[PDB]
Amino acid sequence: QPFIVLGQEEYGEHHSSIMHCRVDCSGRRVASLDVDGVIKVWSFNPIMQTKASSISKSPLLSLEWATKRDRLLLLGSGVGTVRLYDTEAKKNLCEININDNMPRILSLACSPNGASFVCSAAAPSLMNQVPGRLLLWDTKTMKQQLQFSLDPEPIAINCTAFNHNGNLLVTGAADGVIRLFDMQQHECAMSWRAHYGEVYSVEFSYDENTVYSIGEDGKFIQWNIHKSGLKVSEYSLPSDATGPFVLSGYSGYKQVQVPRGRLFAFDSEGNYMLTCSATGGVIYKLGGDEKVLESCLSLGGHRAPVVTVDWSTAMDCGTCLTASMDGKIKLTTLLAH
Ligand SMILES: CNc1nc(N[C@@H]2CCc3c(C#N)cccc32)cc(-c2cccc(N3CCCC3)c2)n1
Structure with missing residues (x-):
């Protein structure tokens, strides 16, 4: 028992499968987006209550909390737009077209x-081996500054993450390639083939000596940031960590969700990792170079596949989000020792 479970509560306001759910930088609000384009913003401590609800007319594909203005949420559409949404005013401040x-x-x-901030912008899917771009913006003006060339060719980028001070950005793309960008020189410092198939999520280790990825080949991999494509470790996760995510009835009728949101998340110092499963969140201890990966805690509580997760740590206490294909989001409260 590296953690004690103080409780599990359910947020049930979504009626469709969850696409993304992310805790804001204060550690006190969630923004969640479902596949019907319903955005919800809610607190959970001490109880769940909804602060904003809106239906998007246009498809929404992506979501990201601002880092230095807690109330602001960036929204990326399926029609070439990035919206700045103010969660206290409950209104779109601006909407900028990617020309x-x-x-x-x-x-x-x-x-x-x-x-x-950065966004990826991709061509329409045909599978997702399609052109895309990587854009850098200025938040003050909400104008684009530049686009990063992608080698060997433009390609859809699925995931992005900055390091702690923001001078490095790591990315994973539909071609299975990880591209790491120096955000001072604005160039690719490093790239390598990471997965057979798409890369779905990428993150810096706490110490920033490695990056972690998860992709379509089922693998969780740790990579040495000081030596391009040198693996540090590699685990085959269970299938239901990476999907595709499938909900069936007897009928011939199924719902299929390909990974879109974050497929893993970490505790404050990155000693533990949360992942998806059919039945709820599954947490593993990192750091080992053991053969099998040490599965230490299962959060449970889901009757439909978990398709995205988050983990925030605030007031010396852990908040885990697990989000399933029935629209349900479980918030599990953890304390360490
Ligand atoms: C608060 N309003 C706001 N903030 C802006 N930038 C913020 C600063 C910090 C930050 C972060 C972080 N961390 C992330 C994303 C955005 C931003 C920019 C604008 C803006 C920019 C252009 C046009 C217009 N309008 C509106 C009225 C007619 C045209 C507004 N507004």
């Missing part, structure tokens, strides 16, 4: 220092 032929805003990342 391009790439309508799918697959990923948004806000710089730690709050001065910039």
Whole structure:
């Protein structure tokens, strides 16, 4: 028992499968988005209550909390737009067109220092081996500054993450390639083939000596940031960590969700990792170079596949989100020792 479970509560206001759910930087609000384009913003401590609800007319593909203005949420659409939404005013402050032929805003990342953000913008899917771009913006003006060239070719980027001080951005794409960007020189510092198939999520280790990825080949991999494509470790996760996520009845009728949101998340110092399963969140201890990966805690509580997760740590206490295909989000409260 590395954690004690103080409680599990359910947020049930969504009526469709969850696409993303993310805790804001204060650690006190959730923004969640379902596949019907319903955005919800809610607190959970001490109880769940909804602060904002809106239906998007246009498809929404991505979501990212601002780092230096807690109340602001970036939203990426399926029609080439990025919206700045103010969660206290309950209104879109602006909506900026990506003057391009790439309508799918697959990923948004806000710089730690709050001065910039990046988005991926991809062509329509045909599978997702399609052109995409990586855009850098200025938050103050909400104008694009530049686009990063992608080698060997433009490609849809599924995931982005900054490091702690924001001078590095790691990315994973539909070609299975990880591209790491120096955000000072604005160039690719490093890239390598990471997965057979798409990369779904990427993150810096706490110590920033490695990055972690998860992709379509079922694998969780740790990579040495000081030596391109040198694996540190590699685990085959259970299938239901990476999907595709399937809900059936007897009928011939199924719902299929391909990974879109974050497939893993971490505790404050990155000693533990939360992942999806059919039945709820599954948490593993990192750091080992053991053969099998040490599965230590199962959060449970889901009657439909979990398809995205989050983990925030605030007031010396852990908040885990697990989100399932029935629209249900479980918030599990953890304390360490
Ligand atoms: C608070 N309002 C606001 N903030 C802006 N930038 C913030 C600063 C910090 C931050 C972070 C972080 N961390 C992330 C994303 C955005 C931002 C920019 C604008 C803006 C920019 C252009 C046009 C318009 N409008 C509106 C009235 C007619 C046109 C408004 N508004």
